């Protein structure tokens, strides 16, 4: 009666939230990303020992897969996910990470993971301990956390991030993905306390605390390199993103990367860069006002140009061109740029024109909302080819070498 312990798992979506995840589908999604990387080919001169903070979904998962299956790296991942249990599917990041460990072992690559709050001292200590035991040191640290809150590791204060404009309220158009309607709403500007809290969570302090802690522990190698992911976006997103409260946080990253680069470049010519990536569908981005509509438009325009990319394609090129290659593709600030295809003037102009014309009636003629919906479901392991969604599956999937914080 093994079906008592198993279930048929279907999507249960509410706005930008899906409360279920499919273990087999997440495994298939991970395999697809791995197969992309191995199909593209290896990346020369990559790091061989990598710490990825935020390693279970989205860009961080893509970085772990790229490092491991592209650069041949041993990888230590840190993330914050819910394991499955009977009757209750775990989070997609849990199942993604289970799959990553399975495939890494098949290839003879080291994979160990730590599940817990990355903002906490405990998790940093557990991470230091794992590196010491296993790897000696790491050559690269990827900082790829997206979180709505942070408990300060010293004072215990809980900071909450806000996704609001700064200065003036803004009329933002968007797509209500449940009702499938184009709708506007007015978002009020952030208070100073809200801006400060957002910087506390998504700014660069914790990144700094990580690098310093690893440094003080002697677990970073000569020539070590670290990067945190950021988003600048097209001008149309500037009100809510770059010049909003979240932008105040990402701008803080810029006030961190200098000190970090300074510490590493003395340590064997190591380096640090904020890396700027394109918008993609993710658990994080889907929750940002305007983003489902913007993404649906951007996908259409970029597909027409042959330049559309998801997480894995974006990060593979970041490693190949910029982190390990001869094309930092530097901007005037010293950031690594991998987002130029989204920011091309002809792309921005086309997105802007469509933005002004889209209505309930022409959604499927003017946008790639179909593609948006598909990629969103894929995040949670749904709609993946070759997966039998009618078969019972055990939601309790275990991960070897998983340290629970
Ligand atoms: N998704 C997008 O359009 C873009 C995202 N970025 C940036 O890339 C980074 C990652 O974003 P996504 O891939 O979208 O996010 P995501 O939602 O797919 O993944 C976030 C990761 O952070 C982990 N995490 C969250 N809170 C944690 C905690 N307290 N302790 C340990 N782990 C925690 C999650 O487990 C997960 O691995 C972010 O800095 C984001 O700003 C930059 C360009 C655009
Ligand atoms: Na991530």
Report which ligand 1 atom has the smallest distance to the Cα of 55.
Answer: 37
Report whether 94 contacts 82 (CB < 8 A): yes
Q: Is 73 in the pocket of ligand 1 (CB under 6 A)?
A: no
269: left (phi over 0), alpha (psi -120 to 50) or beta: left
Q: Which experimental method was this entry solved with?
A: X-ray
Cα(202) to centroid(ligand 1), Å: 10
CA torsion 212-215-217-218 (nearest 10°) is 180
Break the chain into its structural domains and give their ranges: 1-405
Relative to the alpha carbon of 54, which ligand is closest?
Answer: 1
Question: Quick one: which atom of ligand 1 is closest to the CA of 56?
Answer: 37
Placement of tokens 């190591």 in the chain: 270
Distances from the Cα of 362 to the Cα of 99, 254, 278, 368, angstroms: 39, 40, 26, 11
Which tokens go with 78? 């840190």
Query: From residue 43, how far is each of 71, 229, 396 by CA, in Å?
Result: 5, 20, 35
Residue owning the nearest CA to atom 8 of ligand 1: 229
Asked if residue 321 has its Cβ within 6 Å of ligand 1, the reply is no
> How many C-beta atoms lie closer than 10 Å to residue 54's C-beta?
26
Ligand nearest to the CA of 63: 2
Q: Which two tokens stand for residue 122?
A: 């405990």
For the question of residue 241 being annotated catalytic, the response is: yes
Would you say 184 and 173 are in contact if contact means Cβ atoms under 8 Å apart? yes
Q: Is 382 in the pocket of ligand 1 (CB under 6 A)?
A: no
H-helix or E-strand spanning residue 78: strand 74-79
Question: What are the angstrom distances between the C-alpha of 240 and each of 229, 254, 296?
Answer: 18, 19, 17
Q: Which ligand is nearest to the CA of 284?
A: 1
Pocket mutation for ligand 1, best pick of 146, 148, 289 (most atoms within 8 Å of C-beta): 146
- From the list 36, 59, 241, 316, the catalytic residue is 241
Whole-number Å distance, alpha carbon 115 to ligand 1 midpoint, is: 15
Given a contact cutoff of 8 angstroms between Cβ atoms, the answer to whether 155 and 124 are in contact is: no
Q: Residue of the nearest CA to atom 37 in ligand 1?
A: 54
- The answer to whether residues 160 and 201 touch, using CB atoms and an 8 Å cutoff, is yes
**Which of 113, 122, 282 for a ligand 1 pocket mutation test, highest count of atoms within 8 Å of Cβ?**
282
* Ligand 1 pocket test target in 58, 99, 122, 403 with most atoms within 8 Å of CB: 58
CA dihedral 335, 336, 341, 344 (to 10 degrees): 30
Tracing tokens 């993604």 back to the chain, one arrives at 96
- Sign for the pseudo-dihedral over CA of 32, 176, 9, 85: positive
The answer, yes or no, to whether any atom of ligand 1 lies below 6 A from the CB of 275, is no
CA distance 318 to 66: 10
- Can you tell me the distance from the alpha carbon of 240 to that of 225, in angstroms, rounded to the nearest whole number? 31
Q: Is the CB of 79 under 6 A from ligand 1?
A: yes
3-state secondary structure of 117: coil
Between CA 39 and CA 317 the distance in angstroms is 13
Distances (CA, A) of 5 to 20, 28, 95, 105, 390: 16, 22, 17, 27, 16
Measured in Å, residue 379 CA sits from the centre of ligand 1 at 13
1-405 classified as CATH 3.40.50.720: yes
> Tokens 């390693």 map to which residue?
55
Sign, CA torsion 300/172/340/314: negative
DSSP assignment of 345-389 equals HHHHHHHHHHHHH--TTTHHHH--HHHHHHHHHHHTT-S-TT--T
Cα 51 to middle of ligand 2, angstroms: 13
Tokens of 207: 């990144």
Dihedral angle computed from the Cα positions of residues 318, 322, 326 and 332, in that order, rounded to the nearest 10 degrees: 140
Q: Specify the residue for token string 């790639």.
A: 368
Distance 335 CA to ligand 2 centre (A): 19
| 300 neighbors 355 (Cβ within 8 angstroms) | no
For ligand 1, whether the C-beta of 147 sits within 6 Å is yes
Tell me the resolution in Å: 1.8
């Amino acid at each position: 009666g093994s079906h008592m312990l198993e279930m048929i798992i279907k999507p249960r979506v509410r706005g930008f939230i899906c409360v279920t995840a499919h273990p087999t589908g997440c495994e298939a999604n991970v395999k697809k990303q791995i197969d992309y990387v191995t199909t593209e080919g290896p990346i020369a001169n990559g790091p061989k020992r990598v710490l990825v903070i935020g390693a279970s979904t989205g860009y961080g998962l893509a970085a772990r897969i790229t490092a491991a299956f592209g650069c041949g790296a041993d990888t230590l991942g840190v993330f914050f996910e819910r394991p499955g249990e009977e009757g209750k599917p775990g989070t997609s990041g849990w199942y993604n990470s289970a799959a990553f460990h399975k495939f890494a072992a098949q290839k003879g690559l080291y994979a160990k993971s730590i599940n817990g709050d990355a903002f906490s001292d405990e998790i940093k200590q557990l991470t230091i301990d794992a590196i010491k035991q296993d790897l000696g040191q790491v050559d690269q640290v990827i900082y790829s956390l997206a979180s709505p809150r942070r408990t300060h590791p010293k004072t215990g204060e809980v900071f909450n991030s806000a996704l609001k404009p700064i200065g003036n309220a803004v009329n933002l158009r968007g797509l209500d993905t449940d009702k499938e309607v184009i709708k506007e709403s007015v978002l009020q500007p952030a208070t100073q306390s809200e801006i400060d809290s957002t910087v506390a969570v998504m700014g660069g302090e914790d990144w700094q605390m990580w690098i310093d802690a690893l440094l003080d522990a002697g677990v970073l190698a000569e020539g070590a390199q670290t990067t945190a992911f950021t988003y600048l976006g097209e001008k149309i997103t500037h009100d809510i993103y770059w010049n909003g409260s979240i932008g105040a946080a990402k701008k803080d990253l810029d006030q961190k990367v200098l000190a970090i680069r300074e510490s590493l470049a003395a340590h064997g010519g190591g380096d640090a860069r904020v890396s700027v990536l394109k918008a993609v569908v993710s658990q994080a981005s889907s929750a940002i006002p305007m983003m489902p509509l913007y993404l649906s438009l951007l996908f259409k325009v970029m597909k027409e140009k042959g330049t559309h990319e998801g997480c894995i394609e974006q990060v593979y090129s970041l490693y190949k061109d910029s982190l390990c290659g001869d094309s930092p593709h530097m901007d005037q600030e010293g950031r690594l740029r991998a987002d130029y295809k989204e920011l091309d003037p002809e792309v921005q102009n086309q997105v802007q024109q469509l933005w002004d014309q889209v209505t309930n009636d022409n959604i499927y003629q003017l946008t790639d909302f179909v593609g948006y919906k598909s990629e969103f479901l894929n995040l949670f392991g749904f709609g993946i080819d070759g997966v039998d969604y009618d078969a019972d599956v055990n939601p309790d999937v275990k991960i070897p070498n998983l340290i629970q914080g």
